[PDB]
Design a protein around this nucleic acid. Structure first.
Ligand SMILES: [K+]
Ligand SMILES: [K+]
Ligand SMILES: [K+]
Ligand SMILES: [K+]
Ligand SMILES: [K+]
Ligand SMILES: [K+]
Ligand SMILES: [K+]
Ligand SMILES: [K+]
Ligand SMILES: [K+]
Ligand SMILES: [K+]
Ligand SMILES: [K+]
Ligand SMILES: [K+]
Ligand SMILES: [K+]
Ligand SMILES: [K+]
Ligand SMILES: [Mg+2]
Ligand SMILES: [Mg+2]
Ligand SMILES: [Mg+2]
Ligand SMILES: [Mg+2]
Ligand SMILES: [Mg+2]
Ligand SMILES: [Mg+2]
Ligand SMILES: [Mg+2]
Ligand SMILES: [Mg+2]
Ligand SMILES: [Mg+2]
Ligand SMILES: [Mg+2]
Ligand SMILES: [Mg+2]
Ligand SMILES: [Mg+2]
Ligand SMILES: [Mg+2]
Ligand SMILES: [Mg+2]
Ligand SMILES: [Mg+2]
Ligand SMILES: [Mg+2]
Ligand SMILES: [Mg+2]
Ligand SMILES: [Mg+2]
Ligand SMILES: [Mg+2]
Ligand SMILES: [Mg+2]
Ligand SMILES: [Mg+2]
Ligand SMILES: [Mg+2]
Ligand SMILES: [Mg+2]
Ligand SMILES: [Mg+2]
Ligand SMILES: [Mg+2]
Ligand SMILES: [Mg+2]
Ligand SMILES: [Mg+2]
Ligand SMILES: [Mg+2]
Ligand SMILES: [Mg+2]
Ligand SMILES: [Mg+2]
Ligand SMILES: [Mg+2]
Ligand SMILES: [Mg+2]
Ligand SMILES: [Mg+2]
Ligand SMILES: [Mg+2]
Ligand SMILES: [Mg+2]
Ligand SMILES: [Mg+2]
Ligand SMILES: [Mg+2]
Ligand SMILES: [Mg+2]
Ligand SMILES: [Mg+2]
Ligand SMILES: [Mg+2]
Ligand SMILES: [Mg+2]
Ligand SMILES: [Mg+2]
Ligand SMILES: [Mg+2]
Lengths: 128, 384, 61
RNA sequence: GACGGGGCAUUGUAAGUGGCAGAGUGACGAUCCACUGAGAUCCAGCCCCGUCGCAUUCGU
RNA sequence: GCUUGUGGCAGCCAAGCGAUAGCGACGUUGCUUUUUGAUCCUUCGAUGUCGGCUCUUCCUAUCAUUGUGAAGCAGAAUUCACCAAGUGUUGGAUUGUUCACCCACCAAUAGGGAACGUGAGCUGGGUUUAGACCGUCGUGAGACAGGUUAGUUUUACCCUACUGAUGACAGUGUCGCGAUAGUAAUUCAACCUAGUACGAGAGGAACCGUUGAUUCACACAAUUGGUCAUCGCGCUUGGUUGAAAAGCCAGUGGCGCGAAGCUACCGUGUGCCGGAUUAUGACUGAACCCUCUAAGUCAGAAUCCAAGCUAGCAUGCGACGCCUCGACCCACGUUAGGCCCAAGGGCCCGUG
RNA sequence: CAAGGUGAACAGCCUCUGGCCAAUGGAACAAUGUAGGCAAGGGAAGUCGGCAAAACGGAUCCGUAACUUCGGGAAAAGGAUUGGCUCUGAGGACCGAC
């Protein structure tokens, strides 16, 4: 994956775009990133994160689970020189092997997300 | 006691002292190693930074996600009209290092380059090289010139050409004083170098005799001045809390009790910018030759008739009429700043080095606003 | 060149290497020429009411 | 050099004149339309070119 | 500061465990001064006493990363050891903490010093003034090393140090040299290798190549983003100039957009070649068949030195242009070799 | 003693009478300050501690919980509206004002 602008640091709460029952995901860390002193770990589209569920089904709450960011509000530059952003920040609950916990996705997803995650790409409606 | 957490130090100690450069024109600190098997050629050039624009091209790079897809890339335009050779300088080896052996100057020197030898050209009698030019008239004088050249062929180990720019071709520079530099000849034997540099006297050497398309070059210049600056901007340290008495834009601890001195490694406030910098591995995307189709900003895919200059001119520079280089990325210094271009010191055996650039589109919209037209013709046809 | 786009708000041409692309929540792609046309449409101004846009000139001619 | 002209750019259609446009009221009347992508500004650190100007020292 | 009992770290022997892969009882020798004691040498006409934040250097008793040796090392993983301090060692919940303990990421989340680094750098949560509660104690006033809550953090213009800025040093200017000083890059992933080597199986590497990313550094503004007193344009509240047009006041009246300049891992670009070696593994080879060593050689690293990059008033130097007491004496090279066995010689009116 | 406008208002803001431009001046916009602002994406991850700042705010209509010493809580919470212009209706005295 090419570098993208990071828009979602730790403690960001994003919409849940799947149908598992969760309403929002609270990002507690971003996988794969080693840190710097005082820098907040930050995620972008196509990153797997560790999150909890603050609103949603009781059985989904109070546990740490993986998720992948599918939509981000922070504009990022594509290689063709166009800056892109979404209306909201969204993510989908997955397992550590990358498989979607749910079955259906609400709204569009990024092309950067679909390229990395074939199972999320298969369940997506529109890939912009 | 040890510091509670580790982070790397702010800034590099390898660019010390962060002072104002003692020169304005960037200086070549090391020429490429001479290979006597290759033909004689120049190793450097002088140019002027006109401005920036962006290009679109299709990338051929197997294994990349950008393969067979178009990319947008920012480019710097450097206007490089031909240099005039006006002299030769020889160097001999010595246990203390290289030493200038002798120099020979041409009979005709323009007043643009002769202004370089004066602090006040218009108050002087302009006598520089007036008596030196008399050696080319008599016969004993011509004997000295030939004897100096023969001394060059026998004793020199390094031969350099003395060349100056034609600074009056760029009217927007508003300067009559030419820039003068020494350029090394890096081919053949010493006799080959002396013969090659002597045949160029009072002659124009174009940028295509020195560089070619898709070549990695090094750019030398002085960065933009910024004056006195605090530690936060000069060195990139972090700000203190809002609650900090006597201000928050400082380094909190500037050293321990022992050693009982401030160290050279601690960030302090002072001059920021206007530093000498040598930046390497900048690819040449285009060589615009005056009087040829390559000078226009049209590509094989875009047949629109337009010039390299953006609508309304290059901001703070003017119109590019002479030869120029398109170079990927940014370049040292502000607009109008003289920049030294040098051949790479190392072998460029790499994919990025050996990639062949094919331009698809060159933006020529105005850079003085949110420009939306590519030409003045298109703007007038749009409004009627 | 040939692959040039139109602004969704102002209806003007966009050349390669520029453009702001906004994806609405219902998978609608809005391409904007610059920051002015993007700030409008986010302040909810209708392009038919601004005299300098393509839509306004089309309705008024 | 000072103006000026053009290029480029920002805002968004000027004043004025006219209209059997305009809720209604007894001539008034927000607003709308035309002249009008108009008007205004644009180097002060943007680009290109008809009117007017223009004392103190130093000898290797 | 001395000491090192206690704290921490490292050895010797080898009964045992599984003798010395890895461990190791009973004994026994040390080292260290980030523990705590012991002492009372310095300071009471005062050296600002906890902790954290910030910032730089230093150590090695090495946690990861580089190169290796060993295994009860099939692979994968792990453990022991060596050369090594070049580069890293993070984001959080509770707590004033130091210490701790959990969540998570990571290649890894090693340990420490610098007046228990760092208060004319901050902060002031804790300790520890005066107000006030409680418990226990006291006849009482009051005490508590128990808890609780509220409680002023002063000065730099001096010298030095450090960061930058001018500058004389026998004309003036241009182009150069380069002693010396500084220094920098870093780590991870994906793909192919390959479901291959190995293995009964379950499992399961790696080099080369390619493509990216992390941390850092140095620039830059074509685009995106930010910034407005362009007071640039528009709209608008209250007042005011008899109205209208045009403005002004409300210290920037307010709102919208806003070029230019500045600027962001919030944007873009770039970041480096040779030699010597450590560890170790070897060649030839005696001593004395063997032997990496005795002589003589080789390969060898996140190492070192160069190169490159920054400075260069190094009171250093080169080239060019322009002119107001006889002071006598040239071999290279070798000493387990080229007559020599030291210029301990030779030359010179050496004489006025 | 104490005017006009806006406004509920001796609030704030502007103006008339009257009074003043006295607070050393000039040149330039470095760092660090002091006072005052804005800032994409995130939203307390900062810190002993949301310290500081931001958000709320006038009026009209709807609607308002636990608990309660029955007085409160309460402006609880939670929603909607507000400009300009042209009119219309109602509310009086012996022609007028809101
Ligand atoms: K981490
Ligand atoms: K410390
Ligand atoms: K920077
Ligand atoms: K900070
Ligand atoms: K008008
Ligand atoms: K119009
Ligand atoms: K001890
Ligand atoms: K004392
Ligand atoms: K108080
Ligand atoms: K060096
Ligand atoms: K800007
Ligand atoms: K001279
Ligand atoms: K200031
Ligand atoms: K907090
Ligand atoms: Mg912190
Ligand atoms: Mg440490
Ligand atoms: Mg050099
Ligand atoms: Mg304070
Ligand atoms: Mg611009
Ligand atoms: Mg003009
Ligand atoms: Mg100017
Ligand atoms: Mg002990
Ligand atoms: Mg024992
Ligand atoms: Mg004393
Ligand atoms: Mg002191
Ligand atoms: Mg004192
Ligand atoms: Mg060691
Ligand atoms: Mg280290
Ligand atoms: Mg200590
Ligand atoms: Mg201390
Ligand atoms: Mg203090
Ligand atoms: Mg303190
Ligand atoms: Mg101190
Ligand atoms: Mg306190
Ligand atoms: Mg007390
Ligand atoms: Mg009692
Ligand atoms: Mg207290
Ligand atoms: Mg097999
Ligand atoms: Mg008016
Ligand atoms: Mg007034
Ligand atoms: Mg105000
Ligand atoms: Mg950057
Ligand atoms: Mg042997
Ligand atoms: Mg050895
Ligand atoms: Mg070797
Ligand atoms: Mg009164
Ligand atoms: Mg009123
Ligand atoms: Mg009042
Ligand atoms: Mg005063
Ligand atoms: Mg003053
Ligand atoms: Mg913000
Ligand atoms: Mg939020
Ligand atoms: Mg916290
Ligand atoms: Mg914290
Ligand atoms: Mg706490
Ligand atoms: Mg507050
Ligand atoms: Mg309440």
């Amino acid at each position: 994956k090419f570098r993208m602008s990071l828009g979602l640091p730790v403690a960001a709460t994003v919409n849940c775009a799947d149908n598992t029952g969760a309403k929002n995901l609270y990002i507690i860390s971003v996988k794969g990133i080693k840190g710097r002193l005082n820098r907040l770990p930050s995620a972008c589209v196509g990153d797997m994160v560790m999150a909890t569920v603050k609103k949603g089904k009781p059985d989904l709450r109070k546990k740490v689970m993986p998720a992948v960011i599918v939509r981000q509000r922070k504009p990022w530059r594509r290689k063709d020189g166009v800056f892109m952003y979404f209306e909201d920040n969204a993510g989908v609950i997955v397992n550590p092997k990358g498989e979607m916990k749910g079955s259906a996705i609400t709204g569009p997803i990024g092309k950067e997300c679909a390229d990395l995650w074939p199972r999320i790409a298969s369940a997506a409606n529109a890939i912009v | 006691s040890h510091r509670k957490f580790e982070h790397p130090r702010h800034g590099s100690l390898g660019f010390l002292p962060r002072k104002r450069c003692s020169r304005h024109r960037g200086k070549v600190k090391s020429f490429p190693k001479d290979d006597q098997q290759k033909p004689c050629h120049l190793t450097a050039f002088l140019g002027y930074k006109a401005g920036m624009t962006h290009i679109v091209r299709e990338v051929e790079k197997p294994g990349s996600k950008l393969h067979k897809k178009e990319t947008c890339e920012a480019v710097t335009i450097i206007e490089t009209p031909p240099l005039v050779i006006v002299g030769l300088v020889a160097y001999v080896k010595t246990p203390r290092g290289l030493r200038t052996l002798n120099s020979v100057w041409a009979q005709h020197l323009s007043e643009d380059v002769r202004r370089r030898f004066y602090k006040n050209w218009c108050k002087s009698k302009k006598k520089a090289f007036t008596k030196y030019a008399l050696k080319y008239d008599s016969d004993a004088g011509k004997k000295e010139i030939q004897l100096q050249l023969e001394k060059m062929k026998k004793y020199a180990t390094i031969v350099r050409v003395i060349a100056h720019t034609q600074i009056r071709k760029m009217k927007g520079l508003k300067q009559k004083k030419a820039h003068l530099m020494e350029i090394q000849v890096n081919g053949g034997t010493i006799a080959d170098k002396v013969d090659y540099g002597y045949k160029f006297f009072e002659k124009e050497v174009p940028v295509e005799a020195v560089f070619q398309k898709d070549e990695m070059v090094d750019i030398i210049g002085v960065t933009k001045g910024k004056g006195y600056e605090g530690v936060v901007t000069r060195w990139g340290v972090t700000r203190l809390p809002r609650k900090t008495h006597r201000g928050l834009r400082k380094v909190a601890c500037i050293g321990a009790w022992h050693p009982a001195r401030v160290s050279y490694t601690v960030a302090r406030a002072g001059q920021n910018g206007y530093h000498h910098r040598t930046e390497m591995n900048k690819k040449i995307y285009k060589m615009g030759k005056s009087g040829q189709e390559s000078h226009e900003a049209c590509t094989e895919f875009d047949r629109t008739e337009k010039d390299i200059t953006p609508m309304g001119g290059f901001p703070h520079y003017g119109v590019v009429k002479g030869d120029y280089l398109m170079i990927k990325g940014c370049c040292v210094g502000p607009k109008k700043r003289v920049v030294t271009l040098r051949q790479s010191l190392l072998k460029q055996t790499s994919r990025l080095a050996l990639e062949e650039i094919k331009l698809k589109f060159i933006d020529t919209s105005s850079k003085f606003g949110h420009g939306r037209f590519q030409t003045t013709d298109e703007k007038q046809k749009f409004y009627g | 060149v040939l692959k040039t786009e139109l602004c969704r708000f102002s209806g003007q041409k966009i050349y390669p290497g520029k453009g702001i692309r906004f994806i609405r929540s219902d998978s609608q792609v809005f391409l904007f020429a610059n920051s002015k046309c993007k700030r409008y449409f986010h302040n909810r101004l209708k392009p038919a009411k601004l005299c300098w846009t393509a839509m306004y000139r089309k309705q008024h001619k």
